[PDB]
Amino acid sequence: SLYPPPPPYVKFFTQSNLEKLPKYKEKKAASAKEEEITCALDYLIPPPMPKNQQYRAFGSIWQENESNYQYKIQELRKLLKSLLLNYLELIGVLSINPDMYERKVENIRTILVNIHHLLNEYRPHQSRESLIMLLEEQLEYKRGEIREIEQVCKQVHDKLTSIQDTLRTGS
Amino acid sequence: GQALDAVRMRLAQLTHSLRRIRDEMSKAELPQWYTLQSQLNVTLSQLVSVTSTLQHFQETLDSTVVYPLPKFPTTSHESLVTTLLRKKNIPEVDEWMKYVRETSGVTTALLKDEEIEKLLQQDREITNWARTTFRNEYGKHDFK
Amino acid sequence: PLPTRFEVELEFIQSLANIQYVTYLLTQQQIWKSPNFKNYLKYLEYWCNPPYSQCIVYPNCLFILKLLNGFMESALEGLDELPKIIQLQGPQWMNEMVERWAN
């Protein structure tokens, strides 16, 4: 069908199984002093984390104070200059002998791809740095809130003192 | 179109009667019993007329082929179209139907001329006999 | 190879986020009638803490199951209103999820 059937073990655990789970796990721990399914109550025991700390799904694999970059900058500048130079040479190829133009085209793309690889390694280095730009925005917002609070209560205190002087003069 | 037009007007008056009985039941105070009986009987006999007229013009309704308008936009009104163009019963009616099949033992896709046919013939005769018996009983005593 | 129970339970949890899946599951009488399914739903509650929450793909179901948790004391009735209510309350529920995680 369109919707896959519920998992099979779901139907094994009634309320009686839930209430008898404590004594079952106590007995299992006493006896113990891929997990084989010898009893229907085994699944409620929390599954163990794999030792490899890896998870595979759909053909893909998955697994501290925040809680030479100049070399990478100059490499990206020279790569951009070389990319412009290669674009000029490739368009010249199109001008004179376009029949073999593709021979350079993908080459240029490789450089673009290498710039994209630098810009990929650069993500775990920008994504966390978003929390930094957030840091200064809430910090400056709270400083503005604080400063307008001592300002307003100081101007209230000044008004009170002026009133006190006015009433003392009228005495 | 004439049959569907009559179907339309009668269904419209039936819906009007339903709206009526609705807004006189929605009041916090229940009216007199007799008014409720009158409304019930009128609306229910009107439903009977609806059923009978629907039964009369089955061929005109069957001949008609449903097609969306060229001017009607389905991109924006697909929800409205799918509201109207789906027609399954409420589940409590289909499970009631299944419970009725199970309780009666009736099932109508494999039946053939053996025991059920001799039972079918042996049922006709009780009805006719009872009808004749009650005609005789009515004739026995002068009711005029 | 045969996937472990981790994978199937995680995929079930992430598929619970679909409104169509929830409507289909609640359409059948014996799914809600059987206490086994709700027992499994309450068993699934323990994934809201780390490091299990780091393995989720769509955080919305995190509330949905919790919303489904509410369904055991709110009633089936309300199944029809489920798509409308999720569409209407998506903004504030997404905001509260962001407050729970992004802050």
Binding site: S1 | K88 | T23, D80
Partner: peptide, 25 residues
């Protein structure tokens, strides 16, 4: 003329019961 038109009694909240099954190829 027409004494009164009918009030709109639409029920979009109705969930419908369309059976879906031939999805797998």
């Amino acid at each position: 003329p027409s004494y009164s038109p009918t009030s709109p009694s639409y029920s979009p909240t109705s969930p419908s019961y369309s059976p879906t099954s031939p999805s797998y190829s």
